[PDB]
């Protein structure tokens, strides 16, 4: 029954999910446009932790000393301190991170940090660290302007929808917002310079591979996602005070006015 | 809110026994069920009562009655569904069939 209901659902070349009639089921597949096989569980580091831990992990101040950075972390560590343009860049990066923290707490009420997202940033960071032989003692060659601008350009380069109008662009931003939150959480100035200690070429390689892997994770038009979903729901049922298992699945699919255990939850 | 509650119910059924299914599959199911403005049963009195083509409707349930009703109403089946092209024995507009391959004379000359 499930397969027959969903047998005509397909991902089309405008990334919309449509049936045989052309009716739009989802305006983008899975609300993110990503192939399920290219999804891995990753940790959103902005949502978790405390305010003090979040500031220590992300906040960088070039004027005061409470959240200052070690000048030995990067090459021009003594010239950046006291700078105003780079301070403006840091200010907007941290403001964006705070906005992302608030957004992610809004999306997930329980504060769950490990969620399935397409591109594993951690593995790319580790591969870059091993490929470029980070010695973790030499000051980093990166400039902070490079970090901020590279992150912004990478975000601009993650394309799910290729249209050139306001509707398609807004849909693209909505489709990539969660992955962009993950990317900003991982590739932050303090984390890049201190925890990971990237170099210039290592950072650029990380950006290039993140872009390539994200473009590879996009669902391929022509994918018969309806049959895939029907099978992915029916097959786990074959392994199966409130009704559960097969009877509840049938009460859900067979929309029955009266069910065995009608329970209401009051908070 | 009905679609959200439906997704929560289906997710609870799947995840009651510890199994995990990606969000997009259950989301597609619940979106299909709630795309008509109301809860559409996966039963014959819901998804097969949709004007999605007589041939793909008859393959599920009440085949002959569907054919008779389609003949009475002179329905046009545009052969966009998978079951239509399966019945007619032609390449469905799915997967490899979701596009047309065509030969370019200019590129063929350009190679040599």
């Amino acid at each position: 029954r499930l397969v027959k209901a969903l047998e005509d659902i397909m991902v089309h070349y405008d990334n919309t999910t449509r049936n045989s009639l052309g009716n739009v089921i989802q305006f983008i597949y899975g609300e993110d446009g990503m192939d399920a096989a290219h999804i891995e569980k990753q940790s959103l580091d902005t949502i978790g932790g405390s305010d003090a831990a979040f500031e220590k992990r992300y906040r960088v101040d070039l004027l005061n000393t409470d959240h200052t950075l070690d000048p030995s972390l990067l090459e021009s560590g003594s010239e950046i301190l006291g700078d105003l343009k780079l301070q403006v860049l840091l200010d907007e990066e941290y403001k964006q991170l705070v906005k992302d923290r608030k957004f992610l707490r809004e999306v997930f009420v329980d504060g769950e940090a490990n969620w399935p997202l397409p591109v594993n940033i951690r593995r790319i960071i580790q591969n870059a660290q091993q490929t470029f032989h980070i010695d973790h003692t030499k000051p980093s060659d990166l400039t902070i302007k490079d970090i901020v601008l590279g992150v912004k350009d990478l975000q601009e380069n993650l394309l799910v929808l290729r249209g050139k109008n306001e509707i398609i662009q807004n849909a693209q931003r909505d489709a990539v917002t969660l992955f962009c939150c993950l990317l900003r959480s991982r590739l932050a100035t303090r984390r890049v310079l201190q925890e990971y200690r990237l170099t210039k070429q290592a950072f650029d390689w990380v950006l290039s591979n993140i872009e390539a892997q994200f473009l590879r994770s996009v669902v391929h038009p022509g994918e018969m996602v309806g049959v895939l979903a029907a099978q992915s729901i029916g097959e786990p049922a074959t392994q199966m005070k409130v009704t559960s298992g097969v009877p509840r699945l049938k009460e859900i699919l067979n929309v029955a006015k009266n069910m065995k255990t009608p329970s209401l939850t009051v908070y | 809110a009905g679609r959200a509650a439906l997704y929560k119910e289906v997710y609870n059924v799947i995840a009651s026994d510890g199994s995990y299914v990606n969000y997009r599959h259950m989301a597609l199911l619940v979106d299909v069920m709630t795309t008509q403005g109301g809860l559409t049963s996966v039963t014959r009195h819901g998804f097969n009562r949709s004007n999605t083509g007589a041939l793909m409707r008859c393959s599920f349930e009440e085949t002959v009655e569907i054919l008779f009703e389609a003949g009475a109403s002179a329905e046009l089946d545009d052969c966009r569904g998978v079951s239509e092209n399966v019945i007619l024995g032609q390449m469905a507009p799915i997967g490899t069939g979701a596009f047309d391959v065509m030969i370019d004379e200019e590129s063929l000359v350009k190679y040599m």
Binding site: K250, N254, A256 | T43, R44, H45
Partner: peptide, 10 residues
Amino acid sequence: TXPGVTXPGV
């Protein structure tokens, strides 16, 4: 129901 365990109904 079903069948088995039409519908209901039909």
